[PDB]
Amino acid sequence: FPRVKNWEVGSITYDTLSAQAQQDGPCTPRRCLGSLVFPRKLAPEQLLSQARDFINQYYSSIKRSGSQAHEQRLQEVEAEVAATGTYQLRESELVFGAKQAWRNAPRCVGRIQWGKLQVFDARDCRSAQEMFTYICNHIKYATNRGNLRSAITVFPQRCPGRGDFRIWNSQLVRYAGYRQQDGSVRGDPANVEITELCIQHGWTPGNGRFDVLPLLLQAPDEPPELFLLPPELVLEVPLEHPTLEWFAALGLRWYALPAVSNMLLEIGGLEFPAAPFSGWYMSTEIGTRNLCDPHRYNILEDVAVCMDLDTRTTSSLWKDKAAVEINVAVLHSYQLAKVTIVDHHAATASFMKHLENEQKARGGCPADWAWIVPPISGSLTPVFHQEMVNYFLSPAFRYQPDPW
Amino acid sequence: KFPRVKNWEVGSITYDTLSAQAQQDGPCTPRRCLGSLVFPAPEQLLSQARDFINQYYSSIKRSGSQAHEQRLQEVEAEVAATGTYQLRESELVFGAKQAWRNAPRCVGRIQWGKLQVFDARDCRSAQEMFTYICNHIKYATNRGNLRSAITVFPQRCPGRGDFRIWNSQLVRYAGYRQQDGSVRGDPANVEITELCIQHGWTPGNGRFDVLPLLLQAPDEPPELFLLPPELVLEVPLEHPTLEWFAALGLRWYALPAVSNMLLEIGGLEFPAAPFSGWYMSTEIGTRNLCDPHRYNILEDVAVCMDLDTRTTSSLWKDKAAVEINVAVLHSYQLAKVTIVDHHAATASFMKHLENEQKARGGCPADWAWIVPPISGSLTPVFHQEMVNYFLSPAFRYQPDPW
Ligand code: HEM
Ligand code: HEM
Ligand SMILES: CN[C@@H](C)Cc1cc(C#N)cc(OCc2ccc3c(C)cc(N)nc3c2)c1
Ligand SMILES: CN[C@@H](C)Cc1cc(C#N)cc(OCc2ccc3c(C)cc(N)nc3c2)c1
Ligand SMILES: C[C@H](O)[C@H](O)[C@H]1CNc2nc(N)[nH]c(=O)c2N1
Ligand SMILES: C[C@H](O)[C@H](O)[C@H]1CNc2nc(N)[nH]c(=O)c2N1
Ligand SMILES: [Cl-]
Ligand SMILES: [Cl-]
Ligand SMILES: [Gd]
Ligand SMILES: [Gd]
Ligand SMILES: [Zn+2]
Ligand SMILES: [Zn+2]
Numbered sequence: 001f002p003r004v005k006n007w008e009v010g011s012i013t014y015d016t017l018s019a020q021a022q023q024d025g026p027c028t029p030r031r032c033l034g035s036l037v038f039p040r041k042l043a044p045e046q047l048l049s050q051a052r053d054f055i056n057q058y059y060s061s062i063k064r065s066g067s068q069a070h071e072q073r074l075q076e077v078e079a080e081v082a083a084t085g086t087y088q089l090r091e092s093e094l095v096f097g098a099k100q101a102w103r104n105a106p107r108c109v110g111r112i113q114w115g116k117l118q119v120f121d122a123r124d125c126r127s128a129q130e131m132f133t134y135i136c137n138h139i140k141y142a143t144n145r146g147n148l149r150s151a152i153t154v155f156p157q158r159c160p161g162r163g164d165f166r167i168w169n170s171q172l173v174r175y176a177g178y179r180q181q182d183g184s185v186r187g188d189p190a191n192v193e194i195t196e197l198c199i200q201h202g203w204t205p206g207n208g209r210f211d212v213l214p215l216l217l218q219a220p221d222e223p224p225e226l227f228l229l230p231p232e233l234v235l236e237v238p239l240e241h242p243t244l245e246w247f248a249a250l251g252l253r254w255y256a257l258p259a260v261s262n263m264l265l266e267i268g269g270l271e272f273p274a275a276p277f278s279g280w281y282m283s284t285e286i287g288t289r290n291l292c293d294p295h296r297y298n299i300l301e302d303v304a305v306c307m308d309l310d311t312r313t314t315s316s317l318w319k320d321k322a323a324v325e326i327n328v329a330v331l332h333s334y335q336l337a338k339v340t341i342v343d344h345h346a347a348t349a350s351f352m353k354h355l356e357n358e359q360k361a362r363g364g365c366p367a368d369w370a371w372i373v374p375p376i377s378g379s380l381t382p383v384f385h386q387e388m389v390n391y392f393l394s395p396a397f398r399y400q401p402d403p404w
Numbered sequence: 405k406f407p408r409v410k411n412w413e414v415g416s417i418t419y420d421t422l423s424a425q426a427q428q429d430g431p432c433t434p435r436r437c438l439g440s441l442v443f444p445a446p447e448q449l450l451s452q453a454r455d456f457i458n459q460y461y462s463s464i465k466r467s468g469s470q471a472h473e474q475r476l477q478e479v480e481a482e483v484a485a486t487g488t489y490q491l492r493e494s495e496l497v498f499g500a501k502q503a504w505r506n507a508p509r510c511v512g513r514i515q516w517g518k519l520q521v522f523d524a525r526d527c528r529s530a531q532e533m534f535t536y537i538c539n540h541i542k543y544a545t546n547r548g549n550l551r552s553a554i555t556v557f558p559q560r561c562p563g564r565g566d567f568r569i570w571n572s573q574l575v576r577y578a579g580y581r582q583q584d585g586s587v588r589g590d591p592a593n594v595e596i597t598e599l600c601i602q603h604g605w606t607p608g609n610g611r612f613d614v615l616p617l618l619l620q621a622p623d624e625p626p627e628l629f630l631l632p633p634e635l636v637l638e639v640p641l642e643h644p645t646l647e648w649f650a651a652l653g654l655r656w657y658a659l660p661a662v663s664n665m666l667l668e669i670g671g672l673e674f675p676a677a678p679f680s681g682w683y684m685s686t687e688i689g690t691r692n693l694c695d696p697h698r699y700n701i702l703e704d705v706a707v708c709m710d711l712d713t714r715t716t717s718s719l720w721k722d723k724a725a726v727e728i729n730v731a732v733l734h735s736y737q738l739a740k741v742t743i744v745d746h747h748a749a750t751a752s753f754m755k756h757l758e759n760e761q762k763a764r765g766g767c768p769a770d771w772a773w774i775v776p777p778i779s780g781s782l783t784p785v786f787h788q789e790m791v792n793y794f795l796s797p798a799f800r801y802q803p804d805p806w
Contacts, residue, residue: 002438008697024434030426032792033407034437035771283717288781294413300782314747315685315733320726320779324719331717345716369440370771375786377722379690379777380702391436 008385017364021391034390035370042401044085044160050269051077051087054395058096085160088123089268095119097267098152101395102277107371109347109383110279112354113150118142120153128219131155131165131274132227135215139172139233142278143257146235148340152277157270163220165274166403167261169194169213172276173234176211187211190296197404201226209297210236210253218403237337241329246306252299254286254330256339264400273400280340282347287327288375299326323376344374348381355386366391413787420791422766427455428794439792440772443801446483449671452796453479453489456670459797460498487562491669497521499669500554503797504679509773511749511785512681514756519679520544520553527557527567530619530627533676537617538635540678541574545637545659550682550742556667557676558622565622567676568805571596571615574661574678575636578613589613592698599806603628612638612655620805639739643731648708652701656688656732658741666802675802682742684749689729690777701728725778746776750783757788768793 001014026033026040033040055077059070073090080087089097103114118141122134134153142151158164170191177185177192185192187209195213199205203214203226212234218224235256241247259278264271291297300322304311307325309318334341351372358365367388378384407420431438438444454476461472482489491499505516520543524536536555544553557567578597580588587594589611600616601607605628614636620626637658643649661680666673694702702724706713709727711720729745736743753774760767769790780786 002436005442007442018436021435025437026434027432027437027439028434029429029432030793031407031420031423032430032432032437032439034432034439034792035790036407037410037412037789293781293787314751315737315745317726317730317733317745317747319747319782320729323779323782324722324726327722328719331719335717343717343719345719345721373780375781376779377719377725378775378780380694380721380725384777385695387442388440389436389438 002389004387004389006386008382013359015364015389017358017362017393018366018389018391020393021366022394023392025390025392034368038399042399047085047087047269048078048081050394051081054093054097054268057100058093061096086157086270088157089270091121094121094123094154094267097395098154098265101265101267101397104366104393104396106366106368106390106392109282109351109372109374110342112350112357113279116150118149118151120151122153123156125155125165126219128217128222128225131167131217131219132215135167135172135217135276136230136233138276138278139257139259142259143233143235146256146337146339148256148278148280150277150279152265152275154265154272155274158273165220166218167274167276168197168216168218168224168403170260170262172215172259172261172278173229173255173257174213175209176206176213178205188290188297198226208251212236212255235339237333237339239329239333240336241325242332244307244325244329247303247329250299250302250306252291252329254290256280256337258285262400262402264398265395266398267395271398277397280342281334282342282344282374283327283330283334284344284374284376287330288323291326291330292323320376327376344377345381348372348374348383352382352386364389366393407791409789409791411788413784418761418766420766422760422764422768422795423791423793425795426793427452427796430792430794439770446487449483449488450480452671453483456495456499456797459502460495463498488559488672490559491672493523496523496525496556496669499797500556500667500677503667503669503799504554506768506795506798508768508770508792508794511684511753511774511776512744514752514759515552515681518552520551522553522555524555524557525559528621530621530624530629533557533567533619533621534617534629537569537574537619537678538632540680541631541635541659541661544661544680545635548637548658548739548741550659552679552681554667554677554679556674558674560673560675565624566620566805567622568620568626569663569676569678570599570618570620570626570805572662572664574617574663574680575631575657575659576615578608578610578615580607580609590692590698600628611653614638614657626805637741639735639741641731641735642738643727644734646709646727646731649727649731652705654693654701656683656692658683660687664802664804666800667797668800669797679799682744683736684744684746684776685729685732685736686746686776686778689732690725693728693732694725722778729778746779747783750774750776750785754784754788766791768795 001016004015005012026036055074059065064070077087098119099117138153142149155165174191175188176195177187177189215227216224217227236253239252257278258281259276261276264273265275291299303322304318309321310316311318355365368390369388372383409420410417431444457475461467479489500521501516501519527533540555544551576593577590579590579594605616617629618626638655641654659680660683661678663678666675667677693699706720706724712718713720733745757767770792771790774785
């Protein structure tokens with residue numbers, strides 16, 4: 001039972017939940033690989049064992065463990081698999097599954113919200129157009145005219161044999177990236193790949209560097225097709241700065257809804273290749289990684305030049321100065337537009353609150369320190385000086401190979 | 405079957421074969437990771453010692469030679485007669501450097517090959533100890549142009565006690581417990597301050613009182629020593645434009661000289677072997693001055709900057725902090741005392757990784773410690789994957805002798 005200490009306060013806790021961890025991670029006693037983005041890499045007897053674990057933590061989670069309906073539900077599931085191979089979840093369990101997996105996402109700093117997640121059951125989906133509507137309701141529900149709401153939409157579970165549902169975009173809302181006779185990129189270089197996969201599917205390229213990409217959806221076996229997004233349901237925020245009047249004229253913007261559509265939801269031993277979720281941004285994601293990463297928009301030195309900072313030398317800390325103000329502009333803009341946003345100080349402190357809750361509940365909490373700690377002002381936030389244990393619980397969100 | 409490590413900023417892929425030599429085991433299992441934890445006979449001395457001799461004769465391109473096979477036989481025979489063995493002049497220099505080179509949490513290792521090794525293995529008392537220490541500080545400080553150095557005191561041996569330096573650093577500021585239940589000076593050194601005073605030291609009342617040394621010879625009680633005022637170089641902290649900053653009465657010292665870690669070389673352990681380099685501005689600016697439990701000036705500074713401290717989204721914490729770092733970097737250059745900012749430091753650390761990959765095919769590195777405590781993703785070490793492991797020679801922790 002690992003001794004985890006908070007060095008800011010001096011409190012000490014033992015992580016008993018880590019003991020009930022399961023599927024092994026990339027670390028061994030001779031070398032720690034906990035800074036790896038993808039943990040190493042990417043007659044079904046398995047399903048039943050995974051199926052009981054989930055059903056049982058379901059019923060213990062509502063006290064109804066032992067005898068009566070609990071006794072009863074386990075048999076119907078045993079019967080269901082024995083005859084069919086796969087099995088179906090009761091809708092309540094699906095909600096349970098969705099929520100617990102958000103609770104078990106080691107890299108996510110917004111888990112204090114895990115008890116508040118809207119679950120759109122789309123297991124009866126049968127088409128490529130049928131996904132697209134199920135998506136549009138999500139975006140509209142989740143955007144809620146800027147008062148963002150946590151939501152996930154589960155599409156039908158991939159079957160024994162035969163194809164699966166799969167969204168092809170990393171996110172439902174992404175900007176394009178274009179090449180040229182310089183080979184450089186106008187737009188979002190992270191999404192050039194999918195933009196490449198779009199144009200040769202019939203899409204027409206664009207003008208500026210903030211062209212919202214078109215969705216590329218795909219139902220079993222019949223190859224994917226394009227779906228153009230309605231601009232009313234893609235709410236963006238133009239970026240301005242509370243006192244740097246020249247900042248607006250950089251023509252910067254970002255979308256409201258962070259909604260990730262290429263990860264795999266696993267519940268009770270079933271795999272959902274298509275099951276996109278959404279919440280709301282933390283400022284640093286937009287201002288620090290999306291706008292300032294060298295292999296992203298890379299706006300840093302432009303902002304510095306407008307601030308008349310000394311870029312000739314690193315010790316002037318112009319990089320740090322411009323970053324802080326770009327972040328200030330994100331938080332300001334989003335609140336002007338009345339779109340839900342959280343600063344990294346408020347987000348982290350609530351994640352402390354979340355640990356303390358989880359301690360009384362499940363005696364531990366899988367947390368990935370290299371990701372909970374914010375990408376700027378790290379030590380200034382409470383999570384920095386807090387020791388964490390990272391491990392794998394189920395249900396969980398898993399990465400998966402991309403289908404191109 | 406060696407770790408594949410990627411740099412995501414550029415796109416580089418290398419494999420860490422050096423990690424397979426990892427001559428120890430840490431806290432991480434396939435079941436869970438504990439990378440964030442701060443604290444993670446004759447035959448056995450034999451296998452470690454034999455490994456270091458093999459190391460040393462490779463660095464001078466003479467592996468498997470006459471002098472090598474001689475040196476092996478010499479060693480294992482001497483452990484049979486005495487229980488231990490003594491390092492030569494040149495081996496001690498090599499082991500010392502190899503310990504810096506291997507230290508996973510150090511971003512300044514680009515410089516490991518330039519370390520001034522002092523041999524004080526002949527030390528006899530607490531007074532000679534002080535004298536070697538005063539001399540170290542003098543060479544290293546160098547009137548502001550800093551120099552990397554280590555002083556090596558007598559190795560741990562059976563039958564005699566240990567040399568220890570009781571202070572965590574050669575230079576540290578006093579921490580006075582107040583009537584209010586507050587602390588004057590540095591709160592991190594409340595404990596060592598206790599010991600000094602109860603061992604006959606006359607306490608000051610300042611926020612930056614430089615602590616005496618508690619120095620202990622074998623089987624002796626520790627003996628108190630005052631560093632000559634003019635030996636310790638200190639830097640007044642001011643800000644290039646915020647002029648009220650200087651009225652804060654803040655200062656920091658030039659030489660960071662960690663004095664409480666253990667130096668292990670080929671199975672021998674030197675419990676007293678202080679070493680020093682120069683400061684990176686964030687250690688002083690972010691960590692020492694802004695950590696809530698240390699000097700805690702962050703809020704008190706933002707209030708002066710007229711920032712909105714009533715709410716987080718104004719990022720008043722982040723703004724205060726960057727100007728505190730700026731003040732550190734400015735004050736040290738104004739006083740011509742060597743210092744390195746976290747962009748330059750991480751940048752040179754990336755050269756080191758390129759160097760070590762060609763030299764030993766890898767590099768022990770602790771991601772959580774290599775990434776500066778402000779502005780991580782701005783630095784090139786943020787987006788670089790790393791492998792943490794333990795190679796020997798090495799600097800290790802050890803308990804407080806009290
Ligand atoms: C509501 C406020 C939320 C905030 C502020 C938030 C914030 C974050 C942040 C900062 C990351 C780091 C990943 C990156 O840097 O790209 C992350 C990752 C993650 N989040 Fe959250 N999130 C929220 C909601 C949610 C929801 C609703 C879910 C699921 C239903 C979720 C599940 C996850 C998962 C699985 C990851 C890991 C992604 C990966 O491994 O690459 N989060 N989140
Ligand atoms: C010359 C300039 C140097 C710089 C800029 C530098 C930088 C750093 C920094 C910033 C840390 C982490 C600080 C912290 O704990 O907050 C560190 C750790 C460390 N460095 Fe250095 N260093 C330098 C010289 C040296 C030398 C000369 C040695 C050995 C002779 C050394 C060995 C170590 C070791 C063993 C640690 C880890 C200590 C621990 O884990 O508690 N460094 N370095
Ligand atoms: C930029 N980091 C990438 C390099 C790694 C990454 C991979 C995947 C996948 N698959 C998905 C990723 O998305 C991260 C994520 C997922 C969900 C989020 C939600 C729901 C809210 C939020 N504010 N940020 C999120 C961030 C990231
Ligand atoms: C504030 N850090 C603590 C939380 C952890 C720590 C513990 C010890 C010990 N013993 C020693 C430590 O030393 C860090 C260190 C060691 C050597 C350094 C040198 C030689 C130079 C430099 N600029 N910084 C150093 C920083 C750290
Ligand atoms: C190399 C490094 O581990 C990796 O790029 C991680 C570090 N921490 C991160 N943290 C968050 N939130 N998002 C990221 O993309 C990363 N990148
Ligand atoms: C608990 C936390 O991981 C620990 O306090 C570490 C994090 N990384 C660090 N990195 C450096 N360079 N110095 C430190 O003191 C710390 N503190
Ligand atoms: Cl994003
Ligand atoms: Cl220090
Ligand atoms: Gd101007
Ligand atoms: Gd001024
Ligand atoms: Zn690990
Ligand atoms: Zn700190």
